[PDB]
Design a protein around this ligand. Structure first.
Ligand SMILES: CCCCCCCCCCCCCCCCCC(=O)OC[C@H](COP(=O)([O-])OCC(O)COP(=O)([O-])OC[C@@H](COC(=O)CCCCCCCCCCCCCCCCC)OC(=O)CCCCCCCCCCCCCCCCC)OC(=O)CCCCCCCCCCCCCCCCC
Ligand SMILES: CCCCCCCCCCCCCCCCCC(=O)OC[C@H](COP(=O)([O-])OCC(O)COP(=O)([O-])OC[C@@H](COC(=O)CCCCCCCCCCCCCCCCC)OC(=O)CCCCCCCCCCCCCCCCC)OC(=O)CCCCCCCCCCCCCCCCC
Ligand SMILES: CCCCCCCCCCCCCCCCC[C@@H](O)O[C@H](CO[C@H](O)CCCCCCCCCCCCCCC)COP(=O)(O)OCC[N+](C)(C)C
Ligand SMILES: CCCCCCCC/C=C\CCCCCCCC(=O)OC[C@H](COP(=O)(O)OCCN)OC(=O)CCCCCCC/C=C\CCCCCCCC
Ligand SMILES: CCCCCCCCCCCCCCCCCC(=O)OC[C@H](COP(=O)(O)OCCN)OC(=O)CCCCCCCCCCCCCCCCC
Ligand SMILES: *P(=O)(O)OCC(C)(C)[C@H](O)C(=O)NCCC(=O)NCCSC(=O)CCCCCCCCCCCCC
Lengths: 87, 67, 459, 128, 104, 174, 125, 178, 219, 63
């Protein structure tokens, strides 16, 4: 029914949401930017980012796995692995 | 017809579905108005409801209290 | 009846002289032919029975049971050939011989015209069943199950022998026709009470009656598949047939002596359905369902009205077929995973679709689903019990609700859900197993199509 | 403050409202570590058996075997006749029987009395 | 098993059981298809009180409305032939008590 | 139709009102009835005519079995097995015939109720009385014999009823 | 729904009429000469028309005429307005007759109460 | 789901889970987006107000009071994602998931209907069979003498090796198998 | 007993319906309330009005369920009105169909549901019934209007609340034609059926004006 | 063409078989098919005997 997801589409959507986040500078945001090491966020900000990604992609990420997603690339990989996207 | 998905944008609509929806809404309202024009007694009633207090004891067959 | 008895006594030498690889084929083919021949007994008269000779006779109650036995033999052959692949030739022939002897004794039991010959044959049916159970059972409890079965039946049935010889000495004959025409009322005395107790208690233990039934779970769980099929389909119907036969000479004492047995039957029907609700073993669930249905049959026989006898006969036939099919399905599941635990294997609907269909049909027939003969019998019994009293409807409704509950619980637990991950030895269903289920289920629907053939003499 | 929540047997206490969840002794931490170690050892054994490519069949579960054995075959050897068990068995086994006997006997006695007095409506009652 | 954690990687995800762990005695009735004991938003006593109060009040008000019925200020309806004596199955031989309805 | 007997299965004469249309609109029911007659009735009638022509070439007959009367249980001596057997068989045949009589009366009642429709409570009172009488007689005959009914049990019940009637008559005359 | 319910319940049920026991006075009490109601349709006509027993009231002839009109003009299901109106008017007249009966019962009951109160006062005095 | 759990949840993890749950239930209460943004900002203001506290006993007491307040004020019917455990679309496709061991029991004709797929399946089976011994050797080399203290598994330390216990994780059925 | 059972059923189900967030649940509770209304109709000795309401309810409730299914399928299996919004202009045809169905369900003066529910309410008010049952019937009608308004308001009015990837597409001929067929019935079928069936009950020609307008007032 | 093939088989054959079964088998035993007797109104013509059911009496007409 729904069009299949792709790695590029997932990456574009997550970077779109992150650039729409106010606390993140769009210019210095890359796919490998660490949320706390080089973006200057904290635990509550990471929780809000995970919730925003859940609202974006329409599925829930469990708290056990959500705490370990500290990178946009990690989020992309997690979403692709859960949605069985290989291209 | 093929409808492309939109991202954060209003979905693409079709003139056919637009005109069909408008036509059926207009049909419902025209039917309601046409029915109310002809037989409004189904809603507003058709016969007056009598007031029992205005009936005379003479016609109701009630004799005077003394009698 | 010799035209049916002799072909079985010829089945024996054929099996013992056949080749090592043709025993199953020969036995199945000739058992099917014998069943086809025995189908001719369903042409009964509306006035009296079919009196072939001084020794054997056939009635509207005996004919469906004979047809059921003759049709049941090849199905037992199929299941046995399923589970006895590695057995030696002599032991396979011994197993087939035990099955053939059991069928022969059952046929003679149903056709016997005297109560004493009936007793001798229906006691002779113990030996082949005991040997089958205690010899080809899988687990350790087969010995204990055999002991329980044997001693329950014998402790029930010896006073029946004493009462039968006493009745013959008193009246002159044990012939069923003579005791029917020359019947006299049974006065209310202690001696008559104890004679009634002897006869009824023997057949109640055979039924089984609630409180006298533990041998049934013990034997049915621990018996091989053929033993489980014959025990539930036919061997439970000997008690009902006997009670329907002997109650001619027990009136009017049955009016006063039936209360404890009716209360036991109804309450135990409720209790055994509740037990089925909480069973961790599939075979035990089927066994207790059998107990509940036979308790309903006991209630019908005890209330003893023309509408109750027809319902009793129809329910006996339907329960035989349904229980046999359920035992076969459970045996296929067991042979897949080598365990009888209900929750061990799941997702069998997404792993084996046609078997899921067979399970659905068997469970639908197990509960009273119209217009099945199960429902016909249950509804006739319920109507007769309602005419008897107006709280029996409450008890029957409770039983029907719990029956549907546990049947669908079994179906959902076994078939629905997600498959067990670590069970990867579930091969596709065999043509033999599918044919076994089809030959179990089609006769039931055909009997639904033509229901007057299983409603007994009272029709 | 806010109304308290009273746990029952059919509505248990949530973990976040359990008073013992916020008072953690150092022994509680080592107990949790031991529980996790047991779970991890069992999981490792199961996963080895599960992922073995040469395995065909069912991984027999000793816990399931113990449960099935304890539910059915282990009840009688551990049963002793006590006052509690005796009273409960007598009640649950005999009380319903005599209750139903009294109910049915009373109903049938009333019906038979009506029949004998000839004031029971039995017209059209052909089937029985 | 409903109370058990749904996000854990159980060996049997539907039953929510692990291989080798001890099994509860009443596992047969505590499966996700049967009796659920998970915490509720409202306390059990409060739920019982509210439900019982609602049903009892409804029954009481039904009894009250039965002893105080609602009707219209009209007389009984009138039928021509002795309140339709023959049409309701009356015996033709027996003569019914006459029922006469007048004008008003 | 001549398949059954009009006396055994009465039907009141059928009065169908004549059509009196009051509009110029065509009748869809009439049009569909004509279409149905053209498409179905004629083919089925032709097929039945062919089948009945085939049947008339091989016309053969079957008969109704006749049973003579035999001495009954009242005449049978005590423990005379042959006479008891004959009487029991005759009694069973009579029981079957009585059951079929009750069935016929019930069919009459059902048909009359359906035919009268909205006026069944008044126009079916004639068939209700016949059914009441037949049911009363059948109940007095075979009301509580039981599953093992017999001519002896029916005779004992009749003797009990006769004794009760005699006692009631004597009490009334006293 | 109505004021009569309030008067009967939160008031004097003795003075208010009883719907289940009405009438409680002789039909000629207060009426010198009272005419019996006239029935147009006969029992045989109603039976042949197969009117439901709830529809065999004094307005049955209009119902029979309406049914005959509907049957004849079948495809045109809008050509029975006059017959429908006649049947509705007859039912309305029957309903107002019942209302007059109710009102007469009520005022007769209150007149009886007044008379008995006057008699009690006279007995006291 | 994919991450091995720990023996316990730390205070930070507990408060973060409470924060996420409270935000979800607040979004359930506040249906509209602007209202939800307002009240979520207020909730994060509360969390930031109590963010800096050196007394762990007081922090635990505040956490307990917050949990009780949440339980009193939770939504009786909170929003659940369709694929989440409480959702309306949860476990809908579990009946369509068939395993590869079930796949290999096919008839030769059925296998011949898909010639190219089964060659790659045979390659995968050979790859699985050629690594099990190395996997078990690695697992038994790195475990403590007492036994596994956690459910985490080691990766492939060598160039030619595969991570131990990988077959079912890799070959699990797709989320929409049919 | 039937009257009391129907009254309590319709009241309780409507009261539960007015505050549900699952659209299928709301429609199911509306169905239960209509069944309670039918049971009330049987209890006041009006069997034929019950059958008429059965037919009308079949029509418009089937249409409502089809529209709800279309909404659910367009939003990727989302059944929460808290996540629906903007569908008034996002999906024109399902919007107009649901509006017509809700108008018929609540008893619009000349739709399919008018010829049954209005007569049922009139017969309930004009009969010798339980006062509490009559009151509960009226309250149930009001709550029916309430939950229909809730569905419309939380599903079609306002700003979008669904995930940003807009997959909304209702241009399938099968869906359009099925909703079209069930939409004509929700408008005209009641009139035809009411005007074709023979008179099988005595009409309530005379009644007070406020009692005549009770259904519209409470709605 | 597909609709025509569907119509002849699926509709024509069953109606033929059922009409044959009803006309010559079901309506060969008494009381198998019972029709509610047609309603007779005043001023009607019974077609069985050419009978004239008369009109009702004069209505006490109002307005
Ligand atoms: C102990 C409590 C107790 O008595 O429970 C009775 C109760 C019977 O049910 P009930 O409805 O209460 O009895 C109705 C009347 O009380 C009794 O009925 P009644 O008063 O209308 O008259 C009938 C009475 C006429 O009275 C007699 O015949 C009494 C003469 C002595 C009979 C002794 C037993 C002979 C039969 C062998 C029983 C072996 C067991 O008939 C009997 O006594 C029947 C005797 C056989 C009863 C059932 C046997 C199978 C039990 C299965 C469970 C075993 C564990 O339960 C049992 O008998 C079984 C459980 C207790 C043992
Ligand atoms: C087919 C469908 C199903 C059919 C039905 C199936 C089920 C029904 C059949 C089975 C019925 C239940 C079992 C029947 C009784 C079995 C008793 C037995 O085997 O005991 C051996 C068992 C082993 O012997 P032990 O090791 O020396 O004693 C260990 C005890 O823990 C030592 O306990 P303790 O030293 O703490 O004793 C304190 C207390 C224990 O008793 C109690 O706490 C219960 C008190 C109420 C029951 C007695 C009420 C009547 C008392 C006055 C009687 C006046 C008669 C004139 O003692 C007494 O109350 C004094 C003795 C009372 C005797 C009453 C009869 C004479 O002893 C006991 O269980 C002791 C209590 C025995 C009586 C319990 C209540 C029986 C009620 C039967 C009703 C019928
Ligand atoms: C709506 C839903 C409809 C769904 C129905 C699906 C079935 C298809 C339609 C039914 C088929 C047409 C009806 C055929 C029926 O009439 O024949 C039946 C015949 O069915 C068979 O009798 C069923 C045979 C049952 C016994 C089979 C035994 C096979 C071996 C199994 C042995 C095990 C049984 C153990 C207990 C005996 C009943 O006999 P009868 O109506 O009058 O026949 C009329 C011919 N007459 C007039 C000359 C008499
Ligand atoms: C220990 C207490 C034992 C109670 C249970 C009984 C089982 C033990 C059997 C011992 C015999 C007890 C009963 C004796 C009855 C008896 O002999 O009389 C019956 C009567 C005697 O009459 P006459 O001698 O001819 O005199 C004429 C009078 N004018 O003879 C008969 O009717 C034949 C009846 C056969 C005897 C039946 C005895 C058993 C009673 C039924 C119990 C069935 C038990 C079944 C066990 C299954 C469940 C455990
Ligand atoms: C809203 C709150 C309502 C509270 C009602 C409290 C109970 C009132 C009450 O008991 O009224 C009874 C009284 C006498 O009527 P009765 O038929 O005797 O009822 C007694 C039944 N135990 O009833 C009356 O006085 C009025 C009786 C009216 C009867 C109408 C026809 C039936
Ligand atoms: P990151 O590692 O930066 O996380 C910072 C944390 C929180 C870990 C801190 O380092 C920390 O531990 N600080 C001290 C502990 C602490 O923060 N204690 C207080 C936290 S709980 C509290 O104060 C907030 C609760 C208030 C809101 C409760 C919500 C209940 C209402 C919900 C109703 C449901 C519908 C709205």
């Amino acid at each position: 029914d729904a069009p299949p997801l792709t790695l590029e589409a997932i990456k574009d959507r997550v970077l779109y949401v992150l650039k729409l986040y106010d606390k993140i500078d769009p210019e210095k945001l890359s796919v490998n930017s660490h949320f706390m090491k080089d973006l200057g966020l904290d635990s509550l900000d990471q929780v809000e980012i995970i919730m925003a990604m859940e609202d974006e992609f329409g599925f829930e990420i469990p708290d056990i796995d959500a705490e370990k997603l500290m990178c946009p690339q990690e989020i992309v990989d997690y979403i692709a692995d859960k949605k069985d996207v290989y291209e | 017809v093929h409808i492309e998905p939109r991202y954060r944008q209003f979905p693409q609509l079709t003139r056919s579905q637009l005109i069909q929806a408008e036509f059926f809404s207009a049909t419902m309202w025209f039917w309601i108005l046409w029915r109310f024009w002809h037989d409004s007694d189904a809603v507003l009633g058709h016969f007056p409801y009598p007031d029992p207090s205005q009936w005379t004891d003479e016609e109701l067959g009630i004799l005077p209290d003394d009698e | 009846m010799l035209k049916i008895i002799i072909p079985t006594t010829m089945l024996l030498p054929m099996t013992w002289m056949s080749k090592h690889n043709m025993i199953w084929i020969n036995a199945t083919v000739h058992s099917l032919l014998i069943s086809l021949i025995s189908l001719s007994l369903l042409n009964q008269l509306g006035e009296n029975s079919l009196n072939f000779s001084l020794t054997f006779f056939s009635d509207s109650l005996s004919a469906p049971l004979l047809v059921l036995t003759t049709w049941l033999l090849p199905l037992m052959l199929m299941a046995s050939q399923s589970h006895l692949s590695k057995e030696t030739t002599t032991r396979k022939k011994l197993y087939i011989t035990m099955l053939i002897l059991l069928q022969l004794f059952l046929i003679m039991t149903f056709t016997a015209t005297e109560l004493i010959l009936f007793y001798i044959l229906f006691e002779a049916t113990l030996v082949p069943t005991l040997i089958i159970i205690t010899r080809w059972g899988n687990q350790t409890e087969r010995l204990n199950a055999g002991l329980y079965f044997l001693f329950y039946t014998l402790a029930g049935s010896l006073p029946l022998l004493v009462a039968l010889v006493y009745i013959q000495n008193t009246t002159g004959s044990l012939n069923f026709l003579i005791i029917h025409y020359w019947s006299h009322p049974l006065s209310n005395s202690w001696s008559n009470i104890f004679m009634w107790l002897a006869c009824i208690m023997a057949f109640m233990v055979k039924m089984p009656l609630y409180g006298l039934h533990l041998w049934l779970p013990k034997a049915h769980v621990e018996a091989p598949i053929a033993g489980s099929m014959v025990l539930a389909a036919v061997l439970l119907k000997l008690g009902g047939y006997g009670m329907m036969r002997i109650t001619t000479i027990l009136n009017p004492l049955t009016n006063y002596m039936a209360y404890p047995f009716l209360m036991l039957s109804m309450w135990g029907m409720i209790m055994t359905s509740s037990i089925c609700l909480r069973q961790t073993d599939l075979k035990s669930l089927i066994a207790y369902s059998s107990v509940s249905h036979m308790a309903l049959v006991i209630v019908a026989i005890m209330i003893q009205t023309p509408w109750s006898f027809m319902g009793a006969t129809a329910l006996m036939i339907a329960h035989g077929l349904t229980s046999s099919m359920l035992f076969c399905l459970a045996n296929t599941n067991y042979e897949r995973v080598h365990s009888r635990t209900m929750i061990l294997a799941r997702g069998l609907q997404t792993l084996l679709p046609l078997m899921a269909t067979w399970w659905l049909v068997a469970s639908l027939t197990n509960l009273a689903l119209p217009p099945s003969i199960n429902l016909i019998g249950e509804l006739f019994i319920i109507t007769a019990s309602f005419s008897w009293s107006n709280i029996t409807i409450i008890l029957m409704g409770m039983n029907m609700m719990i029956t549907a509950l546990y049947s669908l619980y079994m179906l959902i637990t076994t078939q629905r859900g997600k498959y067990t991950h670590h069970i990867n030895n579930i091969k596709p269903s065999f043509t033999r197993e599918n044919a076994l289920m089809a030959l179990h289920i089609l006769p039931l629907l055909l009997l639904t199509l033509n229901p007057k053939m299983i409603l007994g003499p009272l029709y | 403050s806010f109304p308290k929540y009273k746990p029952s047997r059919l509505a248990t206490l949530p973990a976040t409202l359990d008073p013992a969840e916020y008072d953690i002794s150092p022994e509680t931490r080592k107990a949790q570590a031991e529980r996790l170690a047991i779970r991890s050892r069992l999981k490792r054994e199961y996963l080895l058996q599960y992922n073995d490519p040469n395995r065909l069949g069912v991984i027999e579960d000793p816990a399931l075997i113990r449960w099935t054995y304890a539910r059915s075959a282990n009840i009688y050897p551990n049963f002793r006749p006590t006052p509690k068990t005796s009273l409960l068995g007598a009640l649950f086994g005999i009380g319903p029987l005599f209750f139903w006997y009294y109910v049915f006997k009373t109903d049938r006695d009333k019906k038979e009395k009506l029949i004998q007095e000839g004031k029971l409506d039995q017209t059209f009652n052909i089937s029985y | 098993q409903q109370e058990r954690d749904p996000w854990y990687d159980w060996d049997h995800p539907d039953l929510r059981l692990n291989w080798g762990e001890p099994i509860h005695w009443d596992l047969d009735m505590y499966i996700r298809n049967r009796v659920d004991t998970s915490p509720t938003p409202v306390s059990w006593n409060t739920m019982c009180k509210h439900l019982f109060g609602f049903v009892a009040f409804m029954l009481f008000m039904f009894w009250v409305g039965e002893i105080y019925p609602s009707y219209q200020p009209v007389g009984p309806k009138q039928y021509p032939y002795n309140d339709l004596y023959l049409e309701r199955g009356g015996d033709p031989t027996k003569e019914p008590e006459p029922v006469v309805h007048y004008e008003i | 139709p001549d398949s059954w007997d009009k006396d055994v299965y009465p039907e009141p004469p059928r009065r169908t009102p004549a059509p009196a249309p009051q509009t110029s609109l065509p009748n869809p029911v009439t049009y569909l009835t004509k279409i149905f007659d053209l498409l179905v009735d004629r083919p089925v009638t032709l097929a039945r005519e062919f089948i009945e022509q085939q049947h008339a070439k091989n016309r053969y007959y079957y008969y109704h079995r006749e049973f003579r009367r035999v001495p009954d249980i009242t005449e049978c001596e005590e423990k005379d097995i042959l006479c008891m057997f004959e009487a029991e068989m005759q009694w069973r045949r009579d029981y079957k015939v009585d059951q079929e009589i009750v069935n016929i009366i019930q069919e009459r009642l059902k048909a009359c109720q359906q035919r009268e429709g909205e006026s069944y409570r008044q126009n079916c009172a004639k068939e209700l009385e016949q059914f009441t009488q037949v049911s009363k007689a059948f109940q007095d005959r075979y009301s509580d014999l039981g599953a093992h009914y017999s001519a002896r049990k029916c005779l004992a019940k009749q003797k009990q009823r006769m004794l009760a009637e005699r006692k009631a008559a004597k009490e009334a005359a006293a | 729904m109505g004021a009569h319910l309030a008067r009967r319940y939160l008031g004097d049920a003795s003075k208010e009429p009883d719907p289940l026991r009405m009438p409680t006075f002789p039909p000629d009490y207060g009426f010198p000469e009272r005419k019996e109601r006239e029935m147009v349709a006969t029992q045989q006509e109603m039976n042949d028309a197969q009117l439901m027993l709830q529809q065999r009231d004094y307005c049955a002839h209009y119902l029979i005429q309406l049914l005959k009109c509907k049957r004849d003009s079948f495809p045109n299901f809008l050509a029975c307005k006059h017959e429908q109106h006649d049947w509705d008017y007859c039912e309305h007249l029957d309903y107002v007759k019942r209302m007059k009966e109710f009102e007469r019962e009520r005022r007769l009951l209150q007149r009886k109460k007044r008379r008995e109160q006057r008699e009690a006062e006279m007995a006291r005095g | 789901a994919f991450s091995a759990p720990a023996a316990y949840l730390t205070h930070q993890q507990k408060v973060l889970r409470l924060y996420k749950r409270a935000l979800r239930h607040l979004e359930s209460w506040c249906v509209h987006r602007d209202k939800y943004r307002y009240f979520a900002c207020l909730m994060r203001a509360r969390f930031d107000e109590h963010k800096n506290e050196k007394d762990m006993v007081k922090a635990t007491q505040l956490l307990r009071q917050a949990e009780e307040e949440f339980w009193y004020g939770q939504h009786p019917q909170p929003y659940i994602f369709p694929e989440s455990p409480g959702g309306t679309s949860y476990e809908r496709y579990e009946c369509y998931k068939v395993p590869e061991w079930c796949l290999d029991d096919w008839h030769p004709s059925e296998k011949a209907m898909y010639p190219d797929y089964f060659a790659k399946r045979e390659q995968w089976k050979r790859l699985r069979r050629e690594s099990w011994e190395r996997e078990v050797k690695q697992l038994q080399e790195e475990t403590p003498p007492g036994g596994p203290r956690t459910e985490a598994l080691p990766p492939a330390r060598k160039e030619g090796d595969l991570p131990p216990l990988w077959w079912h994780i890799v070959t699990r059925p797709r989320e929409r198998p049919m | 007993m039937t009257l009391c059972l129907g009254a309590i059923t319709t009241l309780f189900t409507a009261l539960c319906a007015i505050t549900q967030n699952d659209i299928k649940k709301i429609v199911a509770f509306s169905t239960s309330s209509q069944l309670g209304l039918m049971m009330v109709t049987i209890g006041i000795n009006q069997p034929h009005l019950a059958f008429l309401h059965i037919c009308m309810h079949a029509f418009f409730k089937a249409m409502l369920f089809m529209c709800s299914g279309s909404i659910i399928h367009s939003l990727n299996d989302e059944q929460d009105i808290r996540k629906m919004g903007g569908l008034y202009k996002a999906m024109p045809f399902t919007t107009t169909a649901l509006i017509i169905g809700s108008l018929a369900l609540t008893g619009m003066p000349y739709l399919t549901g008018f010829y049954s529910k209005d007569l049922i309410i009139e017969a309930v008010n004009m009969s010798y019934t339980n006062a509490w049952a009559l009151l509960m019937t009226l309250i149930a009608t009001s709550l029916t209007a309430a939950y229909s308004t809730r569905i419309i308001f939380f599903a079609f009015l306002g700003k979008p609340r669904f995930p940003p990837l807009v997959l909304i597409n209702e241009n399938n001929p099968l869906l359009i034609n099925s909703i079209k067929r069930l939409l004509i019935g929700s408008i005209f079928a009641g009139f035809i059926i009411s005007n074709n069936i023979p008179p099988m009950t005595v009409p309530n020609t005379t009644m007070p004006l406020y009692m005549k307008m009770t259904a519209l007032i409470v709605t | 063409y597909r609709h025509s093939i569907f119509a002849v088989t699926h509709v024509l054959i069953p109606v033929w078989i059922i009409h044959y079964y009803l006309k010559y088998h079901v309506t060969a035993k008494p009381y198998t098919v019972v029709e509610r007797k047609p309603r007779i109104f005043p001023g009607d013509t019974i077609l069985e005997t050419g009978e004239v059911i008369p009109l009702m009496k004069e209505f006490p007409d109002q307005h």
